[model samples]
Target: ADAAPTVSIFPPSSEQLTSGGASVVCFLNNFYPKDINVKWKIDGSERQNGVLNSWTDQDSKDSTYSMSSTLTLTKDEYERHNSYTCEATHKTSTSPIVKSFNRNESENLYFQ
Candidate 1:
């Protein structure tokens, strides 16, 4: 009944950026139990403004839970060279799992 979430941060596609804004999707999957905490940290500080969340705490076929969180910023804010991170914490986690998005290092890191 306990499993650490696999965290992934998906960057906004160029089309969305061209549309004058950017949105990143934070996906956490294969976790156990129901309750989880998903947060956002920017420049090492937790920023709560632009975070948007939608959740479905349903058990998958493998008996694990899955959730997704999204963050949105305006075009100006997106261009500020800000470092945005998605934080995932569960009961089984020893520490918050993190994935980050940046202009130079926009790679999606798959963290256990």
Candidate 2:
């Protein structure tokens, strides 16, 4: 019941988070029980627009599953340096797992 997804981020093909139109992907992988809730936020507020969730896929060899969601941002949002966060929740945990992608030392951790 303690299984938690290993989260990672893939930047837009532009290879940078600078101001421009692009989609940032947040990947949730290596988790169990199949069902999980994922959400995206910008500057601490929930961002509903341009959010797309993908269907979960199970690894045939390991039996664990993986899923991902994308958030498309315009130049204005990226220019503002807004703190973006991906929050995930599962029945196995009492609290959501929050990972923030911002202009800080933690930025390196988000990239794959």
Candidate 3:
């Protein structure tokens, strides 16, 4: 058997800023072996899937897949602390396993 898939959420850092019209990027790293699939579901609705929303493996030296997804959204209150899920499933699984990240707006806000 292989190891379980690992998932990550790269919320905009201090360097990243949301100007009401900005792109949100989430990085999925440390996923090896290229047999795992990554997907994004927003508010229980299925969005884009595959390499367009995904990427090729980063490790050219070894056979490992590393990629990311981007969700372009306006800075709105509804999306703040919204529930976004990242699911990875193998071809043989009866159901997929998932991990979620709250799109916290606490760090994306600035006061004048």
Candidate 4:
């Protein structure tokens, strides 16, 4: 077994502001077994419109992996000032690792 993943959430970049939509990336890194799940929530409601991707950490000899899930939102959604959360579940953890950000907050909010 390995340690629970360390998670970070990054808000959309300035470029995203002009696209009428934005994406927030949830990063889960330095975990093991490759059996992990990342879920997104909008205003406390579960969402499934994001993309979750993972890759092995070449620097970690024990097959630890780094994963990211990106949740995209429209301008209306982004401006609603709702709370967004990323929940990461791993076999090694009894409870999911959760990180949250608000639409009205700064873009650099993250959970580690």
Which candidate has the highest lDDT of all? 1
The per-residue C-alpha lDDT of model 1 at residue 41 equals: 75
Estimate TM-scores for all models: 0.74, 0.68, 0.55, 0.71
Q: Which pairs in model 1 have colliding backbones?
A: none
Order of models, best lDDT first: 1, 4, 2, 3
- Pairwise TM-score winner, candidates 1 and 2: 1
**Candidate 4, superposed: residue stretches over 4 Å from native:** 48-62, 108-112
The local lDDT score (0 to 100) that residue 65 gets in candidate 4 is 70
Best by TM-score: 1
Deviation (Å) of 84 in candidate 1: 2.0
Query: Candidate 2 on 1-112: residue-level lDDT in tens?
Result: 3467866655444454444575567777667657777777776888766587776555558766666777766645554544677888887675777777664333443546
Q: Model 1, range 1-112, lDDT digits (tens) per residue?
A: 7888776767655667667887667887678767788888776777757587776658666687876787766766665535768888888986989887674465433247
lDDT of 3 by residue, 48-103 (tens): 54323555545666445555655554445334536666666754343565666665
What are the lDDT scores of the predictions, listed in order?
0.72, 0.65, 0.52, 0.69
lDDT for model 4: 0.69
Q: After TM-score superposition, what is the CA distance of residue 25 in candidate 1 from its true location, in Å?
A: 1.4
Q: Mind sharing the TM-score for model 1?
A: 0.74
Q: Point out the worst 10-residue segment of candidate 3 by lDDT.
A: 14-23
